């Protein structure tokens, strides 16, 4: 069986090699440069005692949720800086948070291996745990709402699952990874999603079928961060190699790599602008670099954090960028 | 230029801030500890006072200690160890009786000690089951020289043979700790029996010294 695997793997390598007639940079060589981009901190959100691990924007583009080591989940009003809610968490170790597309619910995850869904809008006027989802044998690295009922999670079990929150049991499990799944991103159409793992491979997943469509391998080390291009035909990865790579679903291969000899720190986060021309990456070097997605030329730097940047998010309308960090402050950039 | 509803929202935000500050001030008082031992080390048996993560609380001299034990993960710990870089200290428990496991224990200690995130954190090393170690050394059926040739030619700086063996085993870990030489973090070695009246006291003294060194560095005395 192993010998048969090599032939099919060799067939795949020839298939993607044959398609690479032109390079992305060759195609977009005659495109006007975006030039230097400058953004300044419009708002600095204070109130988190300890380091911030994760954040997520609401679809209304004004509210965001953040999770921190101090054991609190806080919903902010970005425009006015006010705190809408502050949720006490049973476990102080929280690796991820999510905000529902409707905004009625938020979710949580961490080393306790349980995903806790919170009901923001309720009679009696307090946030309460609607459901605690159990069934993962490892820490939850990420969680994202498809809708109010359904939520996908990724774990250190090397498995991802689709949960029905009303029933509280998994409806599908995704088992392709050979390492802890660090990140996931949902396609805009929601019919499919990607996952990144310490295996250093990214696999396209079909939510309805429960199978892996494609697998992408270009990273030497773990893939910390994953994001889908706004069109949905491509996605961008972040790893500990201090390089980001753009992959294309249809071509099934790499288009462009965003690497600079100056920087050696790993990429903690990646995000895309609304147009997709800009790729924003968060590093352990206490700063975020803005890349021209087409030309892979650095267009700017966002440096205001005294510690590493845990999370990075771009608003749905694309007006603002929010970056959390281990110094316990979130900054809105514009 | 703020509506009444916006003013009420701001007052609610300020009340939330006050409650968060109170909770943080309450949380600061406890000293947080991390307990790491691969297996057969008696890491649960170290402290007599008491699925993803196990938490233990013991109090000594009106000081609250939090000890976390993460046992639901694989042998590799690179990802979840990032969270525990704010801890006061890391408690490493190793069974000195089993000589075959000692090389793996030394490799684990080196990996923890040289981890980038845990560079600031000091370690408290409990060499455990010293009574079983002494019994094996007196019996002599198991030879330390076979596993580590250095013991066959060693001199000390409880029987003398047992003392030499225990000093040798301690010296390996102390040398791995000394190899860094940074001084920001120090390894405090101790020898613990299977049942010991006081280990929270030792942890308390080591945490007192750990905090004292940080105080000296902050006050620019060093």
């Amino acid at each position, epitope marked *: 069986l192993r010998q048969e695997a090599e032939q099919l793997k060799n067939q795949i390598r020839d298939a993607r090699k044959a398609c690479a007639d032109a390079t992305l940079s060759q195609i977009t060589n005659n495109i006007d440069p975006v030039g230097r981009i400058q953004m300044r901190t419009r708002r600095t959100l204070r109130g988190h005692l300890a380091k911030i691990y994760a954040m997520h924007w609401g679809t209304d583009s004004r509210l965001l949720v953040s999770a921190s080591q101090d054991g609190k989940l806080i919903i902010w009003d970005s425009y006015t800086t006010n705190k809408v*809610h502050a949720i006490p968490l049973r476990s102080s170790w929280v690796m991820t948070c999510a905000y529902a597309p409707s905004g009625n619910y938020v979710a949580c995850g961490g080393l306790d291996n349980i995903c806790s869904i919170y009901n923001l809008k309720t009679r009696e006027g307090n946030v309460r745990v609607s459901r605690e989802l159990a069934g993962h044998t490892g820490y939850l690295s990420c969680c994202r709402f498809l809708d109010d009922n359904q939520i996908v999670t990724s774990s250190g079990d090397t498995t991802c699952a689709l949960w029905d929150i009303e029933t509280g049991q998994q409806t599908t499990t995704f088992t392709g990874h050979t390492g802890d799944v660090m990140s996931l991103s949902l396609a805009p159409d929601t019919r499919l999603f990607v996952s990144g793992a310490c295996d250093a491979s990214a696999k396209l997943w079909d939510v309805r079928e429960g199978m892996c469509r494609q697998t992408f391998t270009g990273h030497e080390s773990d893939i910390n961060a994953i994001c889908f291009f706004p069109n949905g035909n491509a996605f961008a990865t972040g790893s500990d190699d201090a390089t980001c790579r753009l992959f294309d679903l249809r071509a099934d291969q790499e288009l462009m790599t965003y690497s600079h000899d100056n920087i050696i720190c790993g990429i903690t986060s990646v995000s895309f602008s609304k147009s997709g021309r800009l790729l924003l990456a968060g590093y352990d070097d206490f700063n975020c670099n803005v890349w021209d997605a087409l030309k892979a030329d650095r267009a700017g730097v966002l440096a205001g954090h005294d510690n590493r940047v845990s999370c990075l998010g771009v608003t749905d309308d694309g007006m603002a960028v929010a970056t959390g960090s281990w110094d316990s402050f979130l900054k809105i950039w514009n | 230029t703020v509506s*009444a*509803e916006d003013k009420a929202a701001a*007052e609610r935000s300020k009340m939330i801030d006050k409650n968060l500050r109170e909770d943080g001030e309450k949380a600061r008082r406890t000293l947080r500890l991390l307990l790491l031992g691969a297996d057969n080390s008696g890491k649960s048996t170290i402290v007599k006072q008491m699925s993803g993560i196990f938490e233990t609380k013991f109090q000594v001299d009106k000081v609250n200690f939090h000890m976390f034990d993460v046992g639901g993960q694989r042998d590799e710990r690179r990802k979840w160890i990032q969270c525990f870089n704010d801890v006061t200290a890391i408690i490493f428990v190793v069974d000195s009786s089993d000589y075959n496991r000692l090389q793996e224990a030394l490799n684990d200690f080196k990996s923890i000690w040289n981890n980038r995130w845990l560079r600031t954190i000091s370690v408290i090393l409990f060499l455990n089951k010293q009574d079983l170690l002494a019994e094996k050394v007196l019996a002599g059926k198991s030879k330390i020289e076979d596993y580590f040739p250095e013991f066959a030619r060693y001199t000390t700086p409880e029987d003398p043979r047992v003392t030499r063996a225990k000093y040798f085993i301690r010296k390996e870990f102390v040398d791995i700790s000394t190899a860094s030489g940074d001084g920001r973090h120090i390894c405090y070695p101790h020898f613990t029996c299977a049942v010991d009246t006081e280990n929270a006291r030792r942890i308390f003294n080591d945490c007192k010294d750990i905090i004292l060194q940080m105080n000296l560095r902050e006050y620019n005395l060093v």
Partner: single-chain antibody
Amino acid sequence: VQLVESGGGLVQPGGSRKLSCSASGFAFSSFGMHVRQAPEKGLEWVAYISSGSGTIYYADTVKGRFTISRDDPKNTLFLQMTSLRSEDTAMYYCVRSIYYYGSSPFDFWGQGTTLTVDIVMTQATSSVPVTPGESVSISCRSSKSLLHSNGNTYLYWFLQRPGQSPQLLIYRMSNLASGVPDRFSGSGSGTAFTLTISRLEAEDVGVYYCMQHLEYPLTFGAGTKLEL
């Protein structure tokens, strides 16, 4: 959730009476608490006590006479009333209101207890003839524009059915309060607002009050009564 008012009955002029509303089933500390209806007049807002009692407001009619206080652990709100006059006779309502981005204040009202002893909001028609199954429209106006710079227009619509407390229908002129059928809609422009009911049915008959929350004191309209 429940708010049960206590105290009332006959009081001589110049006497003092304490009215208390006891809260059960909701987090009393988080909510700010507030309203009286005269025997033959629309609603009038008496006093407000914020969460934590940090902020207090009174109507100019009752300022210097009434005092509003909350004892959070027992979940009770008090109104200490002094120098009662003939005008003070009314039915007093205990109302809860929570203020954050997207909250629906004035959502729940108490039953109320009878006692026997500035933006001008105007409703055009005191009574409007209606028929079952026929769409109707209700109009209210503001002396001053209720649209704030931040973009929210602070207009609220309440419904008081016969023998029942007012119920919130629409908050901030467009949002529909939870538990309300979709038929109700709020279309509004600055200084002029309206409520539209489509497929009107029985049990939706009552006085429709328009309120402004732009600034204190809170003013209620006279209200428009619907009868089949």
